[PDB]
Amino acid sequence: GILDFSNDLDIALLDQVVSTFYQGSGVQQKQAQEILTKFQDNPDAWQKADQILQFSTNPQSKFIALSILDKLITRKWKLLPNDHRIGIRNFVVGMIISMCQDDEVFKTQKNLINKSDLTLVQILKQEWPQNWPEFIPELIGSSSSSVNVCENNMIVLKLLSEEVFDFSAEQMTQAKALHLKNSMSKEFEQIFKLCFQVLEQGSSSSLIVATLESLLRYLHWIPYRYIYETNILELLSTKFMTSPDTRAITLKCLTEVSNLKIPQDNDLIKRQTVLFFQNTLQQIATSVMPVTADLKATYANANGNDQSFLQDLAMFLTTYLARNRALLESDESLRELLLNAHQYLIQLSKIEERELFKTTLDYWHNLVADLFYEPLKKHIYEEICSQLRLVIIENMVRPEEVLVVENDEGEIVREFVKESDTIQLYKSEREVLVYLTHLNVIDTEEIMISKLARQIDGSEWSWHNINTLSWAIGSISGTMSEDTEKRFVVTVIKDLLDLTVKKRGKDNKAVVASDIMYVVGQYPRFLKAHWNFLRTVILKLFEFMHETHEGVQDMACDTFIKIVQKCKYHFVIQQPRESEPFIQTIIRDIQKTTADLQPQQVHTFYKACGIIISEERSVAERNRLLSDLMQLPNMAWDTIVEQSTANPTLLLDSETVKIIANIIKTNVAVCTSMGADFYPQLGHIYYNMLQLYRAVSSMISAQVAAEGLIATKTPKVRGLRTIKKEILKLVETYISKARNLDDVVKVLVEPLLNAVLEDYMNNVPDARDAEVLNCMTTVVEKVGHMIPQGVILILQSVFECTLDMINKDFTEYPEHRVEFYKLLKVINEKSFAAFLELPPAAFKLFVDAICWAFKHNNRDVEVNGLQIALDLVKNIERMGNVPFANEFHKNYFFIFVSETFFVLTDSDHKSGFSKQALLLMKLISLVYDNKISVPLYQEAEVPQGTSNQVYLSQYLANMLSNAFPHLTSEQIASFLSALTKQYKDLVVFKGTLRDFLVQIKEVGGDPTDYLFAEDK
């Protein structure tokens, strides 16, 4: 056995278990893991920690012992007598010293040392300075005893600063956090002395680096006087920048220095600010590299430390310049320095590392915005700007990206990525280059024409180069005057066409052509001003739609729909020179045009045509265009509805299911583009489509009932589910975009509900689609205020059965959980009357369902659950001293209070905190604002006429005492007093709750802490 959960402890065996877990593999390592976890979670395990720390031959065992000690210190420290406390404290200091005296251990086991130090810092939080007032003097004194102890002292101080200033919120009560911050500020003169002495006398070494590490953390909070009124600025900016081993951490320190709270009307501080920066830059120039250094090549061939350094350099410059560019600009002697620093960024901007480039680009954006709005200083940075232009043009990223995903039905679907890192980078670059173009149009144009010419002669020809250049050219769209834009676009397109003729290979031609289309798609103004060109492009795209070359068809469809999105008006109007709106021409030949396209590309083409059609404002002509467009799918739909009605077996034919899917998908596409305008088409296929839905759903449910869950994965059921989902998607799409709500209510709602609600109830769980709930959510969102009986039917159909699906655990049917509470929420918003009419038992189930959502370790469910609770309480508040409200309070007020507290005080429900607090405030408000007009108690259990305030207080005190017996009466009383005094202030209330949440995790918390807000 490797079980060490007995009475006597085997240190060797524990080492064995630890070694099995850390160096072992597989099932053994698994068991070892569970064992170690069980041992580590023993309330009494700390009693063994010291023994381990003294006897274990395993560094990891010591680490785990320190973890157990950490638990004891954080949670049950104040249970121990003062004697024992001091004992453990001196045990840890002594152990730390022992480890430091061991040079091997000190250098090779930083992890164990850091754990030790952190354990000490935990003891400091709990003890210092009230019970350990001599700690900082003793620590500084001991610094001389060993170099390792000196270094470790710097680690301990760094850790203490982190715990007190960096990570104190949400780990400590506001009162205790203030106490520790004040304690650490009081004794910082001494700490800074030790620090400065080490920095001033010491030379580059591990101890110096550790000292600077600590200084980095100090800089977050220390007064600027320790930086500006001492010689530390000179030390950092000169001494520690020359020594390689300290450059990076010194830069980090100077980065934070750049961000200090300093006086804004002190000329000496201004000169000091300039001076350290001038020193740092000159020192980098002298010791590291000049402005002329090729940082791109350097970074590429660098060793990671050098890379980090270069990153840190950019962080330094970008921080300092963003704060102090004005300072560097005002005095013309500083000109050479200013430009030099910017030059570094330029060089740093050339480094191929996205995150570093983004860091530089934020600043670049700042600078070019400032120059745009203050063109007086523009000339100073003319040269810098010119180079920046080239940088950005050379480093344009893809403006839009596409993913090919497989959905739950097994379909291969092309989706456009939205709001990605790359897209935000594109947008940032675009804004920077737009600014740059505004600043000097002539320079931007010259650069772009040069890159293009270098593309033509083949000197800089590559797919990536031409793509980048194209993206760049497209990015500055709408910046030049239409005349200048006209000449520019003409040149670019002409050159690119000549390039295409010159390039050999289908690959190369495709690349350049796709670039041509991207560029033209990026300049809608040029297309609108020149119809002939627009037509030529559209036809050329149609021509491309028959090209089998990989990617070309998608390019053509993407360009087409992109161009129409912007230029729709020019398709619906008769452009003289044309005998008919070009939309008619497109619709005429749609069969021929889209013959070679993939299904999804066809759908995109229809979507495009829909965009165009919705531009026609005459209802008659628009409806005709829509009809003409939908003719092919309409006709196949007619022939299919006839055969299906007559022969149900057709839905067994996979070819039919395909055709049906494509028909509904085409409807979805056109409905997407056309919105309310699509209603005629929807009406054309509606009732039949709902029937087909009922059929496909019945078939899915039957087969799943018969075969089990596996059936849901079969190609047959997958195809059928596609049809089901597409139908639901069409309906949701139209209703979401609908304008004429009467027609929705009176024509669409009733058939839809009849079709899908009863089907959903009667489906087997494994066949129910959450999309049904989603569709219902959208219906309720849009017209729920108009369909009270419809909403009631939705509840009656989905509530009990979906609940019963998802109330077994937190894991089964996740999509169902999400959409169920989204629907409950929207119903509660739009048609709360429905919940009013439910029988008492049904309403109880509702409340149970809300509280069920509370307990979910799922953000999607949890937030909706809390929102429902809030909204419900708001809804019932709207009703006055009405028996329903009174009864609801009598039945559920305390349920809601207790459930909210349960999820507040639960370890793992932090996402809902913001909402939880609100709900709690509201509930408390209802009692402390005297807005509940009936006693919330019973039996006269509290004497007649007892105020609901006193009863709420009693209930809360009792409940919290039961839940948390380790809190004192004084703790609970004070917390409740604070809550009941602070229910009108959200931020203070949240503070008080966080204080309580800190205090329930520990024993012997200070009841005064709840007066924190009242104190300030």
């Binding site: 397109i493 066409l497 052509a513 060109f533 090209e547």
Partner: peptide, 16 residues
């Protein structure tokens, strides 16, 4: 002329 000539060139755009 110049836009029209662009149209002609655009029309001739080929991937072969």
């Amino acid at each position: 002329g110049e836009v029209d000539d662009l149209c002609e060139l655009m029309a001739q755009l080929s991937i072969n």
